[PDB]
Amino acid sequence: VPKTSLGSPPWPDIVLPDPVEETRHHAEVVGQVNELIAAGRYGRLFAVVHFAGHQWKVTAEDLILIENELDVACGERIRLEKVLLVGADNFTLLGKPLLGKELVRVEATVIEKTESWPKINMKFQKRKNYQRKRITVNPQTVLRINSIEIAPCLC
Amino acid sequence: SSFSKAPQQWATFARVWYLLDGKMQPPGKLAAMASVKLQGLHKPVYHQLSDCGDHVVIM
Amino acid sequence: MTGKELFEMWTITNPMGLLVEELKKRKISAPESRLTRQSGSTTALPVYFVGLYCDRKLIAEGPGETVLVAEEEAARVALRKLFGFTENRRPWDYSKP
Amino acid sequence: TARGTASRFLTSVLHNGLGRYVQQLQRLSFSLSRDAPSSRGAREFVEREVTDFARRNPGVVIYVNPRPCCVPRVVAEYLNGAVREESIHCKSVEEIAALVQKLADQSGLDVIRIRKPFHTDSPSIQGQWHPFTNKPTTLGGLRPREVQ
Amino acid sequence: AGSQWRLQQGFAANPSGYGPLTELPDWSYADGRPAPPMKG
Amino acid sequence: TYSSLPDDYNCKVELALTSDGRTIVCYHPSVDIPYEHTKPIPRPDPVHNIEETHDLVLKTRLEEKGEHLEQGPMIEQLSKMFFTTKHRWYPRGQYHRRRRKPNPPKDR
Amino acid sequence: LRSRVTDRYWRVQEVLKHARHFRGRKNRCYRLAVRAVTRAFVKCTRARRLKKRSLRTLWINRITAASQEHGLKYPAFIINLIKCQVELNRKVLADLAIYEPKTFKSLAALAKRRREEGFAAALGDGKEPDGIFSRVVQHR
Amino acid sequence: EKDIIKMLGLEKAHTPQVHKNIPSVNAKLKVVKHLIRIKPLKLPQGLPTEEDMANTCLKSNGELVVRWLLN
Amino acid sequence: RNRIPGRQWIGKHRRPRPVSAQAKQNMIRRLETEAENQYWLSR
Ligand SMILES: [Mg+2]
Ligand SMILES: [Mg+2]
Ligand SMILES: [Mg+2]
Ligand SMILES: [Mg+2]
């Protein structure tokens, strides 16, 4: 077989494993991860969670600020359902596109329902005598995430 | 992972010296990676205000 | 104590001595300090990484400006790992039993 | 303006809400008048809603003071020692109740620009990136052009 | 990005469009009782 | 044995998919540096200022080292040492030194 | 009834308080302060609009750095992560790259696996052969 | 063309609108065909009834799903 | 050295700014979309 510069593609050839072997390996890996979860050998867990239109990377005993008011009183506990990603020192669960509520539970306590610092929005136009000044005060909510829980229900 | 604040900061913002052979190499392609390394665009901790910069020695 | 470090309030003086005493208690012979990685030696701001090997097994690693500081940091990391006070430990449980 | 005003990070007093939640509002003192027309809202709020608010929140000491004053005022002192003074001059009962609820829900910290909307202690779980965390080690730790 | 792939698979061009990331309730009480509905 | 990325740098990644199909897991144990890829710590300890006649003077011989240079040479030396420009080391005026925040906010 | 202004001091101070950190006579003279304050607010609004773009570009640059550190290009990484139905924005990706090197390397490996599966499927042009990670999951 | 787009109810861009397949509106669609994308409405589950009006959705592929997010 | 007489995009001698492959692909895509529209507007 002739060998030229353009005879072969300029990238290494990729070989994929057989589907049955891949399924067996995935089953073994998920079983090992489930055994780790059941034994509780995980120290700390972080989670990427979608809330209030934003995605937040949150660990235990953390603080987050939400730019919109929530219909909850201060000191109330709230369970965050939209979990995008869970991770720990040795393992990591990726949702497609979300994790299970029974699989992962995250709880946060409302601390402060306050108002943000005044934001100035001023529009000015050249030599047309157009000035428009507004002061915006945006209600904000502070959430303290206390614990991140994971259940061994993973097949 | 469990480092003190000063050594962790030093490790995070440590400077690195890279080597680059220039024999039979195009100046533009050499300068592309040289500029990337000098600006620190190869570091996820890069920032314009930060002084993240790595030394490059081209022979 | 949230976000704090054990040594920030313990203030020990000889991390290497404390580590070797703890290893003797745990039936470990001796830690060996080996230079794993470094960045510049003649520069004004050298960076060194020193790891601790027991029976040629890495137990901890530490960065530093100088080799001695890197070794001390590696000893501190090994001591924290042995005592369980690590950044990846279980967060304190705040619940109602 | 960020460059013109001060700034602070997202912080909580005494790590509130971790073990338990503590209402940061300590005392709330209303100063009003009985004959000034401007104090109508304060008088009506004292008549109607102050008792219900006191029952709902027992952790705040509520003081009421009628005095020959022209500007009805409300002073909230928080557990931080911070004092926030507001004017209830010519406001309806609903506005007074909303302001009181806002003061109760406030943590008493400075109302300035917060640099980051998040605050996580020790976010370096599983490690923190360093220029050596993705570079493979060579045999013996030799330099690229160092001969052993 | 990746809008054409989502359109081919049937999902919205924007992941915020009628997806589970937005239609589902983002939060609920710790007791399990449902949260108030979202204005959007 | 298959992995998209080599397991040579800091961890060994093993990807898997749940039998349900809605969850992706990855076991990534950390990788320790092998003993064969390290070098011994260099030790430099030498005291050439020691004198057999008077150790009291020998000890001060290693501490009485001092030098003073002009502003230009000092800035040039600092720039050469730290691989920077000479414009950074020059001082600043009252207008800039007064407006610095005495107590900047601190995180962590 | 001759009417005069008495609160002109406070009227001037309410504008001067926002210009106390300027350079020159713009922090003292009122006539030179009003123009600077107005332009300062206009620039504040423009920069508030541009802050989202600037931070998005910074996140993209950090993601490019971390992906090239794993030998993978940013467009390929992004498209392959999207194909795996992993909806993580650039902010979260940059945070993971900075603080979760193992997680980011796992994501890069998943993206490379997805890219290899897509290339194999394109080369094969076979309906029956489908990659393990190329399967599409509907909503539930 | 502006008036045609106004009378067609397409003031808000990137928002689908449903119209008849009659030539009367086809004339205007031909007039402003260079500014719009037109697709045929698909009903795999048929016309929604009065009991399914609150549970309907419009997928981007061009079909109208009657039962959306069952519990 | 090389000056553009008059305004850049008004005068008799304009900027020689060419057409790009991105613009060509965009025009082709728009043409395909409009062709599909005119097909659906046939019956
Ligand atoms: Mg809206
Ligand atoms: Mg916007
Ligand atoms: Mg001209
Ligand atoms: Mg011209």
Query: In terms of Cα–Cα distance, which of D97, D14, D28, D39 is closest to D64?
Result: D28
Token pair 């005022």 in the structure block, residue: D73
C-alpha span between D122 and F17 (Å, rounded): 30
Hey, is the C-beta of A75 within 8 angstroms of any chain E C-beta?
no
- The DSSP element (H or E) to which G74 belongs, if any, is helix G74-83
Q: Distance between CA C85 and CA C8 in Å, rounded?
A: 12
| Residue numbers in G near B16 (CB within 8 A) | none
**Alpha-carbon distance D125 to nearest alpha carbon in chain B (angstroms):** 7
Q: A52 CA to middle of ligand 1, Å?
A: 13
How is residue A10 written in tokens?
A: 């300029």
Residues of C with CB below 8 A from D135's CB?
37
Task: Decide: A131 and A123 in contact? Cβ < 8 Å.
Answer: yes
User: Which residues surround the ion ligand 4 when the cut-off is CB under 5 Å?
Assistant: I 6-7, 10-11
Q: Which two tokens stand for residue D79?
A: 């557990």
A48 bridge partner residues: A57, A85
Per the omega criterion (within 30 degrees of 0), is the bond before A97 cis? Answer: yes
Contact G72, G111 (CB under 8 A): yes
Q: What is the DSSP string of C26-62?
A: TT----EEEEEEEE-SSSSS-EEEEEEESSS-EEEEE
Q: In this structure, what is the dihedral angle of CA atoms C83, C85, C88, C91, given to the nearest 10 degrees?
A: 130
Q: Contact D125/C3, CB-based, under 8 Å? A: no
Q: Which residues of I are known binding-site members for Mg(2+)?
A: 5-7, 13
Chains adjacent to G (≥3 CB pairs closer than 8 angstroms) = A, B, D, E, F
Q: How open is the CA angle A37-A42-A43, to the nearest 5 degrees?
A: 155
Angle between helix G74-83 and G101-124 (nearest 10): 80
Residue closest to G107 by CA, chosen among F4, A55, E15, A60: F4
Starting from the edge strand earliest in sequence, which strands make up the sheet with A104-115, in order?
D118-119, A62-66, A139-150, A104-115, A77-80, E27-29
Look-up: residue for tokens 């190329």? G134
For chain D, domains (ranges, CATH) are 1-148 (3.40.30.10)
Q: What sign does the dihedral A40-A42-A43-A47 (CA atoms) show? A: negative
* Residues sharing a CB contact under 8 Å with residue G138, sequence separation 6 or more, in sequence order: none
> Chain C within 8 Å of F24 (Cβ-Cβ)?
no
Cα distance from N-terminal residue to C-terminal residue, chain A: 49
Q: Does A112 touch chain D (CB under 8 A)?
A: yes
Overall residue count recorded for chain C in this entry: 97
Residue E16 Cα to ligand 1 middle (Å): 13
CA gap A71, E33 in Å, rounded = 14
Report yes or no: D103 and D25 within 8 Å, Cβ to Cβ.
yes
Helix (H) or strand (E) holding B58: strand B55-58
Resolution value in angstroms: 4.6
Of G41, G99, G105, the CB nearest to D128: G99
CB-closest option in E1, E9, E15 to G87: E15
Q: Can chain E be said to touch chain F, i.e. do they have 3 or more Cβ pairs within 8 angstroms?
A: no
For the annotated binding site of I, the residues are 5-7, 13
Residue of D60, D105, D114 to mutate, interface with A, max A Cβ within 10 Å: D105
Which residues are registered as beta bridge partners of C33?
C52
Q: What is the dihedral of CA F100, C65, D121, D82, to 10 degrees?
A: -30
Backbone angles phi, psi at A19, to 5 degrees: -60, -40
- How many structural domains are present in chain G? 1
**What was the experiment behind these coordinates?**
cryo-EM
Name the residue range of residue G104's domain: 1-140
Q: Kindly give the distance from the C-alpha atom of residue G25 to the centroid of ligand 3, in angstroms, as a whole number.
A: 38
d(CA A108, CA A63): 9
Closest chain B C-alpha to C56 CA, distance in angstroms:
21
- Which ligand sits nearest to residue I3's alpha carbon? 3
The radius of gyration computed from the CA coordinates of chain F, to the nearest angstrom, equals 29
**Sequence-distant contacts of A25-29: CB under 8 A, at least 24 apart:** A25/F2, A25/F14, A25/F16, A26/F16, A26/F17, A26/F18, A26/F19, A26/G132, A27/F16, A27/F19, A29/F14, A29/F15, A29/F16, A29/F25, A29/F27
In DSSP notation, chain D reads: -TTTS-EE----GGGTTTS-----EEEEEEEE-SS-GGGHHHHHHHHHTHHHHHHH-TTSEEEEEE-S-SS-EEEEEETTS-EEEEE-TT--HHHHHHHHHHHHHS-----SEES-SEE-S---TT----TTSSSPPPGGG--TT---
In chain A, which among 83-112 make CB contacts under 8 A with chain G?
84-85, 87, 89, 92, 94, 96-97
Q: Is C55 left (phi over 0), alpha (psi -120 to 50) or beta?
A: left
Phi, psi angle pair for A139, to nearest 5°: -60, 140
Choose the mutation target among A120, A123, A126, A128 for the interface with G, i.e. most G CBs under 10 Å.
Answer: A120
Q: CA-CA distance, F10 to F12, in Å (whole number)?
A: 7
8 Å CB contact of G100 and D3: no
The DSSP secondary-structure symbol of A146 reads E
**How far apart (Å, rounded) are the C-alpha atoms in residues D25 and D107?**
7
User: Which residues lie below 8 Å from residue F48, measured CB to CB, with a gap of 6+?
Assistant: none
Chains C and E contact (Cβ–Cβ under 8 Å for 3 or more pairs): no
Rg value, chain B, Cα: 14
- The CA distance from A146 to A77, in Å, is 10
Q: Are H34 and H43 in contact (CB under 8 A)?
A: no
Strand spans (E) along A11-129: 46-51, 54-59, 62-66, 77-80, 83-87, 92-95, 104-115, 119-125
Tokens of C24: 């003797």
CA-CA distance, C93 to A149, in Å (whole number)?
12
Paired tokens of A38: 């059941």
Whether residue A139 contacts residue A116, with contact meaning beta carbons closer than 8 Å, is answered with yes
C-alpha H70/C-alpha H57 separation (Å) is 12
Q: Is D143 on the interface with F (CB under 8 A)?
A: no
Tokens (6 digits) for H45: 């589950």
A147 membership: H or E segment, kind and range: strand A139-150
From CA H38, how far away is CA B47, in angstroms rounded? 46
Is D22 exposed, middle or buried, given 0-12, 13-18 or 19+ CB atoms closer than 10 A? middle
Q: State whether G21 and D4 contact (CB < 8 Å).
A: yes
Neighbours of C28 (CB within 10 A): 15
What's chain F look like in SS3? CCCCCCCCCCECCEEEECCCCCEEEEECCECCCCHHHCEECCCCCCCCCCCCCCHHHHHHHCCCCCCCCCHHHHHHHHHHHHCCCCCCCCCCCHHHHHCCCCCCCCCC
